[PDB]
Amino acid sequence: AKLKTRRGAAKRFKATANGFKRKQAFKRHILTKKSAKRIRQLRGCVMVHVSDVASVRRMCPYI
Amino acid sequence: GSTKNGRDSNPKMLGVKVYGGQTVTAGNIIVRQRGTEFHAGANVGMGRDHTLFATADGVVKFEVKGQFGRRYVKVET
Amino acid sequence: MRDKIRLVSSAGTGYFYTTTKNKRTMPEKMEIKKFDPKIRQHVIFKEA
Amino acid sequence: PGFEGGQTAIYRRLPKFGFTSQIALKTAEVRLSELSKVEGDIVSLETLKAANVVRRDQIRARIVLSGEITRAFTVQGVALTKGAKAAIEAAGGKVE
RNA sequence: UAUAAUGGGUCAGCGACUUAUAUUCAGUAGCGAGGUUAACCGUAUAGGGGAGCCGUAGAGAAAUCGAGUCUUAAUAGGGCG
RNA sequence: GAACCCACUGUCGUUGAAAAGCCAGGGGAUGACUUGUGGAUAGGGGUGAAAGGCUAAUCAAGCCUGGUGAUAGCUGGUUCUCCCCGAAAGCUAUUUAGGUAGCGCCUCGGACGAAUACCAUAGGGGGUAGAGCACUGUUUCGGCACCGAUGCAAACUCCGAAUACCUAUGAGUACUAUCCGGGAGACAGACUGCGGGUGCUAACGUCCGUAGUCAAGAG
RNA sequence: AUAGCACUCUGCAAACACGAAAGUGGACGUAUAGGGUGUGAUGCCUGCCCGGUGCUGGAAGGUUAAUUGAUGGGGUUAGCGUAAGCGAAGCUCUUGAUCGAAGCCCCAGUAAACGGCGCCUAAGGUAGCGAAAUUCCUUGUCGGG
RNA sequence: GAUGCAGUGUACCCGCGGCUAGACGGAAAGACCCCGUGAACCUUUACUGCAGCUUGACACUGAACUUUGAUUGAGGUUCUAACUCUGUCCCGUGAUCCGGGACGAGGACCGUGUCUGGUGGGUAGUUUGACUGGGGCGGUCUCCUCCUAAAGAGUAACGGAGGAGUACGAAGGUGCGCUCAGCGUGGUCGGAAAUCACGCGUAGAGUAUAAAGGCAAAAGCGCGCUUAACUGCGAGACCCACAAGUCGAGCAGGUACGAAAGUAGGUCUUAGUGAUCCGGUGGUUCUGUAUGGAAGGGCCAUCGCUCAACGGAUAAAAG
């Protein structure tokens, strides 16, 4: 049968030219205590680690 | 019974990173220290956590100077 | 115990900062000058 | 696959983000070098669909500058980037 | 593990990594900026059938733009190409 | 107290004559008695003067068939030949501790080439062995909290190596180092020497660091 | 198990049990009878506690489910105005005023109901018995054999 | 814990009757003990659901005469036509069932359908952590400091010894200025020990908090003005399996202090904490299913309950 995507992973990973991109955790609720530097730097998207790239490919075959 | 001890903190990895005679570029950290074991000299900057870093490209050097006998680390261009 | 509070810009931009306050030692509200990036000028911020 | 022995998995310790655009699934992109597959000098959505460089269910298309063309084409109803338009006019075509 | 740890009284015959589909990599062959049909028709491994799929362009949540694009007041700086 | 109905003691038998018996004793024997024939109650139900007893040699949920090839991180087994390379029993996380996942260690292919290693020379930080009382604590003897002498310390230090580690230049000898990808196994270790905690300076004891051997290696 | 004893329920289309219902047993019976529960011939007898749980009766004092829907807020739509940027019906999305029984809270009785019987509580063992199917120290102390 | 290994002693080959000291003898994949995120049955003030019981709203459900409360719904007294009878009589019918007719006793009650509150081990499905010199009981589970730790980093034990789940609009920034603590002499009710003057030696003082490393340009102490406890970034480094964590020159804009060079992206530093999903709030030149709106969704900022078994089985759970 057709391979099936893991929709949870699909909703967390998008495809780039040479890999996958994602956002960072720790930005949801507890924010007042955090320093401005952490807010600024941890805002944005980062790339997936190679150690997890194989898992991401297994989870999302069609991207 | 039972012991009331058995706790310790995680390691911090403090110590020197660049020794004398090594080449450094601006921004390289040279010493990680809880206190001011070493003092910044020429072309060396001090952070909020007392970390010493290089502010210019050059070569690291260690010395003893001053009336207090303070150990100094500098960078020669 | 310290309570969380906001400082809202007086220019109507809707910009706000967050901080903590000791109620028993500061019964009244807080006013302070801060930079507002939406208008790019230092203005007053009031407690909320 | 994805089970890591019990600790929270990578795909569940990161936040979900984004929303899917419906119009993007109907929008199409066409490389300038593909216009050689078109029969005739009229370049439009219908002719691109006939040449099979654009899927039938698409409702709009855009031409981007990727390769080189060697014929004059008159483009009707298709969006053009600055480079693609420059290349078309250089080759001797016209827009509208 | 000679172990006083397990299994076998002996012979003959039987007895355990398969099948279908999808995907990734490697070898090999055709064609090559192109490659290739599915169902189906077809006194039928031929021939026909171009719907569709992969490649050919990225950036951004997106609108959008496009060898650039996102962020920003910034043709600064930085990320992905 | 016979028949009939029972089963209190002992011997024998335990691959028995018998998947519950024989022999010698024993109890009831006009009663809530014993018994033939036919019938009623069906499984989370029936019946039970009540033992979780009986319900076709089966009962803390009968039997047959079907779901069905249930699941089992567990135990066992896994069949012809030759050549090359060759581990690990660690770290981190886990309702995790005899499972699994990432990294560390093995093998194969591709891109590269001394960028790698041994030794010599040059530069560099240290707070251990030892030693010491100048801080902290403790110890003994004498003279006015103090002075002189004397001794001790993992959590004391006025001092302080040999080794180990980082960088730079170089001869000689060695296909080394680095990156990308295909395939794993493994995450129960053991003894010995050295530096140590624990134990009794006990254990083929237990827990770390470091080297050799076994594991997987005969002579 | 037993005769005997006691508590409690049942006024007949009885209580109770079986069943999905129809219906059936109880019973072709009728409180001197039928069901449930505990004790267990007979003699002497059967002490205190209603604090807790349970059952029975009363109270109507507080709490509110469905139902019901007074208000308040929002979306869309009309119409004047070079120019303000305004905002009506209708339709529609929300909010929850009031009303609205029990249960619960409260008072009292009940122990041959469960249960309890050491300064403090609801009260701290009456008759009787006792190294006793109940005693760890225990082969408790004394008399008989 | 040896018929089979080493040394050494003894012993010609083979039956029959008897015996049970050994062959860790045969018999049943140990029932005792532990484990598996196995099973079954039982209990309950473990979790969760249902039957049963009980409360009220609407429908079956009608008529007449009347009373009282905050137009309205709460009652009282009668009636019969819906409806009840496991009551009598007649017929089908030679029938203790059933149906129809007549009467009698009740009657808008009782009971039934939908909804709804309470109760509910009667019944059903489940749960009830790990480490551990066996298991249980006890103790512990996350972060910070010192020793073990063998002079770089790192390094275990139910090894030794202590802290943390905060505080501060000043206890932050800047300009300027000042040094502690201890002893020796004199003085009021003030002396072992209060305040004041001089002199001696010397950091033993202090640093919001546990300890370590530090602290004279004092990082210790005081005054004036203020909000840089800013926005957009960020060359280059440390640390790490990932998720994460940490330092930072330098550029642009708006500031505070200073005559000026200049300093300031919180506090001497190292603990003072919680991923993801769902939900709330402010902004938004994003999207919003025929079209214009709106609802909803996305992006930026932010908030709350819980996950201390502190990488957090389903935010619901014992024997």
TrEMBL record, chain C:
One of its GO terms (molecular function) is structural constituent of ribosome. One of its GO terms (cellular component) is cytosolic large ribosomal subunit. The keyword Ligase does not apply. It holds the Pfam family Ribosomal_L33. Belongs to the bacterial ribosomal protein bL33 family. HAMAP family: Ribosomal_bL33. This is Large ribosomal subunit protein bL33. The lineage of its organism: Bacteria, Pseudomonadati, Pseudomonadota, Gammaproteobacteria, Moraxellales.
